[PDB]
Write a protein that holds these residues in place. Structure first.
Motif, mmCIF file in Angstrom:
data_model
loop_
_atom_site.group_PDB
_atom_site.id
_atom_site.type_symbol
_atom_site.label_atom_id
_atom_site.label_comp_id
_atom_site.label_asym_id
_atom_site.label_seq_id
_atom_site.Cartn_x
_atom_site.Cartn_y
_atom_site.Cartn_z
ATOM 1 N N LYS A 21 55.659 26.397 55.805
ATOM 2 C CA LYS A 21 54.905 25.468 56.068
ATOM 3 C C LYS A 21 55.008 24.131 55.569
ATOM 4 C CE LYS A 21 50.657 27.114 55.138
ATOM 5 N NZ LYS A 21 49.323 27.456 54.884
ATOM 6 N N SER A 22 55.608 24.021 54.553
ATOM 7 C CA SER A 22 55.984 22.730 53.840
ATOM 8 C C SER A 22 57.253 22.199 54.486
ATOM 9 C CB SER A 22 56.451 22.907 52.294
ATOM 10 O OG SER A 22 56.526 21.988 51.644
ATOM 11 N N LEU A 23 58.159 22.680 55.193
ATOM 12 C CA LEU A 23 59.315 22.329 55.775
ATOM 13 C C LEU A 23 58.777 22.080 57.118
ATOM 14 C CD1 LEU A 23 62.056 24.962 54.900
ATOM 15 C CD2 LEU A 23 61.869 22.753 54.082
ATOM 16 N N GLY A 24 57.634 22.298 57.666
ATOM 17 C CA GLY A 24 57.027 21.881 59.018
ATOM 18 C C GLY A 24 57.574 23.121 60.080
ATOM 19 N N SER A 82 74.880 19.747 52.203
ATOM 20 C CA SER A 82 74.334 20.755 51.325
ATOM 21 C C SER A 82 75.544 20.791 50.135
ATOM 22 C CB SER A 82 74.458 22.009 52.009
ATOM 23 O OG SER A 82 73.234 22.262 52.866
ATOM 24 N N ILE A 83 75.285 21.353 49.185
ATOM 25 C CA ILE A 83 76.271 21.639 47.884
ATOM 26 C C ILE A 83 75.877 22.902 47.302
ATOM 27 C CG2 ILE A 83 75.313 20.115 46.157
ATOM 28 C CD1 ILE A 83 78.199 19.439 45.706
ATOM 29 N N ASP A 98 66.890 13.307 55.020
ATOM 30 C CA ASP A 98 65.845 12.204 55.219
ATOM 31 C C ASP A 98 65.155 11.984 53.882
ATOM 32 O OD1 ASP A 98 66.576 12.700 57.816
ATOM 33 O OD2 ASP A 98 64.864 13.998 58.319
ATOM 34 N N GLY A 99 65.939 11.893 52.884
ATOM 35 C CA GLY A 99 65.312 11.733 51.676
ATOM 36 C C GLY A 99 64.734 12.741 50.840
ATOM 37 N N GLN A 100 64.488 14.012 51.301
ATOM 38 C CA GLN A 100 63.969 15.129 51.183
ATOM 39 C C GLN A 100 65.096 16.095 50.338
ATOM 40 O OE1 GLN A 100 60.820 17.114 53.007
ATOM 41 N NE2 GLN A 100 61.303 15.702 55.000
ATOM 42 N N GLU A 101 64.567 17.061 49.715
ATOM 43 C CA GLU A 101 65.740 18.148 49.098
ATOM 44 C C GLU A 101 64.756 19.313 49.134
ATOM 45 O OE1 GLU A 101 66.198 16.801 45.111
ATOM 46 O OE2 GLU A 101 67.641 15.197 45.481
ATOM 47 N N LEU A 117 63.238 29.884 46.504
ATOM 48 C CA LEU A 117 63.148 28.543 47.385
ATOM 49 C C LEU A 117 62.202 27.578 46.943
ATOM 50 C CD1 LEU A 117 63.125 31.068 50.416
ATOM 51 C CD2 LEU A 117 64.901 29.663 50.318
ATOM 52 N N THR A 118 62.458 26.454 46.800
ATOM 53 C CA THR A 118 61.491 25.456 46.364
ATOM 54 C C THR A 118 61.510 24.057 47.442
ATOM 55 O OG1 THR A 118 61.901 26.111 44.233
ATOM 56 C CG2 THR A 118 60.702 24.024 44.502
ATOM 57 N N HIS A 119 60.441 23.843 47.732
ATOM 58 C CA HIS A 119 60.474 22.567 48.538
ATOM 59 C C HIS A 119 59.003 22.030 48.321
ATOM 60 C CE1 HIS A 119 59.397 19.999 52.296
ATOM 61 N NE2 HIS A 119 60.501 19.434 51.754
ATOM 62 N N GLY A 120 58.694 20.667 47.948
ATOM 63 C CA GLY A 120 57.620 20.081 47.552
ATOM 64 C C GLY A 120 57.053 20.756 46.313
ATOM 65 N N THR A 121 55.780 21.118 46.665
ATOM 66 C CA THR A 121 55.006 22.214 45.460
ATOM 67 C C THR A 121 55.149 23.574 45.903
ATOM 68 O OG1 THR A 121 53.066 22.009 46.656
ATOM 69 C CG2 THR A 121 53.262 20.317 45.008
#
Ligand SMILES: CCCCCCCCCCCCCCCC(=O)O
Length: 132
Positions: A21-24, A82-83, A98-101, A117-121
């Motif tokens: 959901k956080s990734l859209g 990616s790295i 897009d400035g996100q990670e 896996l982490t994105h946002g909170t």
């Protein structure tokens, strides 16, 4: 990296819906994802690593050298830079767009492969067991 190599099957997952959901990712893809149990294959040929993710829904494959940036198209159709590196014994995959990670961290605990896996909170943890 040698202890990561082999074929791994998903046996547990927590919070994948929150991460997607956080990734859209849309609700219909989230439905299928919550029920899929992928196989991850990690192979090496010299300094080139190949990471395959196979499932009944989508399949992905990436090849990379540790510490060298590469272009990646993700399973949810993001085009990212990616790295992948080894950090404290963990295989750390960082995706930037897009400035996100988002980070995908793999670590071996008691012979199991734990993927965080982490994105946002949002934080999702997936546990994989080695297939002989
Ligand atoms: C590739 C199998 C999962 C199907 C879900 C596809 C849409 C969401 C993709 C989010 C980023 C990839 C998540 C990787 C999770 C894992 O390797 O277990």
């Amino acid at each position: 990296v040698d202890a990561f190599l082999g074929t791994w099957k998903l046996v547990d997952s927590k919070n994948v819906d929150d991460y997607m959901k956080s990734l859209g990712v849309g609700f219909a893809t989230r439905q299928v994802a919550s029920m899929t149990k992928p196989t991850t294959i990690i192979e090496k040929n010299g300094d080139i690593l190949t990471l395959k993710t196979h499932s009944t829904f989508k399949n992905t494959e990436i090849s990379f050298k540790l510490g060298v940036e590469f272009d990646e198209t993700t399973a949810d159709d993001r085009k990212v830079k990616s790295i992948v590196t080894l950090d404290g014994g963990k295989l750390v995959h960082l995706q930037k767009w897009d400035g996100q990670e988002t980070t995908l961290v793999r670590e071996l605990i008691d012979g199991k492969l734990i993927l965080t896996l982490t994105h946002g909170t949002a934080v999702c943890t997936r546990t994989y067991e080695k297939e002989a």
